[PDB]
Design a binder for this molecule. Structure first.
Ligand code: ZN
Ligand code: ZN
Ligand code: ZN
Ligand code: ZN
Length: 287
């Protein structure tokens, strides 16, 4: 039974190359490389991780695959390509033989997510990915979930992974008594598709981390974990740390422990084994 952190990032920091790292995120404005990640996974008895593109550009893919090439603690890479380019097939061929297992576009930052995913060229690209057993990670804000519903139903030839449980507006749960229900309804609509699975990661950072995580935030996160479990089922949940991004809000140990405590309560031993690497292993085709 593999134990896998299914979602983390690496980078040599350069401000202009990571526009999403902005004011007040000083902790991220430095290098994070596999050597810093190792002890963190060691403490959680995690054996290997999956490195996910942290910026747009083929060079990010090159970078991650270089880090990964001969490092056993990196089991796969989720890269970046322009999926709308007709040259997509020839460019991906450059990564043949490698640990590349999937792709991700930062849909959340698009101005018209729905127009973007429904685009005929992008659609053609995602269809090619699926025809070739590449996973596609879906990264959207909670409000954008209905915008990708038709896109996820359409692309059903291979696994789609919903990143960060679709980012519930955790900071709003006490101001907005519709926030949890709205997201749960959309989550359920996606989870009804058998080829879509869910990453349980990136939750601490949807809370109001600038003020500091509080006990109420942890309770809301458990409500989201419970809703994810109900909608997806225990065999379609995948742990990820979202390190180093999670450091805005919590330590790696804190991120794993809150999932661990929740899992000991809700899941059987075999289901925990799925959560902690079994599901990532089968969906990303890990050895
Ligand atoms: Zn070790
Ligand atoms: Zn190599
Ligand atoms: Zn296939
Ligand atoms: Zn991430």
């Amino acid at each position: 039974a593999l134990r896998i952190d299914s979602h983390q990032h690496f980078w040599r920091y350069r401000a202009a190359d990571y526009p999403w790292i902005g004011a007040g995120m000083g902790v991220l404005a430095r290098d994070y490389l596999p050597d810093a990640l190792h002890p963190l996974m060691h403490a959680q008895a995690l054996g290997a991780s999956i490195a996910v593109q942290a910026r747009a550009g083929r060079d990010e893919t090159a970078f991650l695959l270089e880090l990964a090439c001969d490092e056993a603690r990196i089991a796969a890479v989720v890269g970046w390509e322009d999926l709308r380019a007709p040259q997509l097939a020839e460019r991906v061929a450059e990564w043949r033989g490698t640990k590349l297992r999937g792709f991700r576009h930062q849909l959340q930052d698009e101005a018209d997510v729905r127009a973007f995913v429904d685009d005929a060229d992008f659609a053609r690209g995602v269809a090619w990915l699926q025809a070739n057993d590449y996973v596609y990670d879906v990264l959207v804000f909670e409000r954008q979930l209905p915008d990708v519903q038709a896109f996820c139903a359409r692309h059903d030839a291979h696994w789609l992974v919903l990143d960060h449980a679709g980012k519930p507006a955790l900071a709003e749960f006490d101001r907005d008594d519709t926030a949890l229900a709205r997201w749960r309804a959309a989550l359920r609509e996606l989870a009804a598709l058998p080829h879509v699975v869910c990453k349980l990661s990136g939750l601490v950072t949807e809370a109001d981390w600038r003020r500091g995580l509080r006990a109420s935030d942890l309770r809301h996160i458990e409500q989201c974990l419970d809703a994810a479990l109900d909608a997806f089922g225990p065999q379609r949940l995948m742990f990820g740390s979202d390190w180093p991004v999670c450091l805005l809000a919590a330590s790696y140990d804190e991120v794993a422990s809150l999932v661990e405590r929740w899992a000991e309560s809700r899941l059987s031993a075999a289901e925990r084994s799925a959560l902690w690497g079994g599901t990532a292993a089968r969906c990303y085709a890990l050895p």
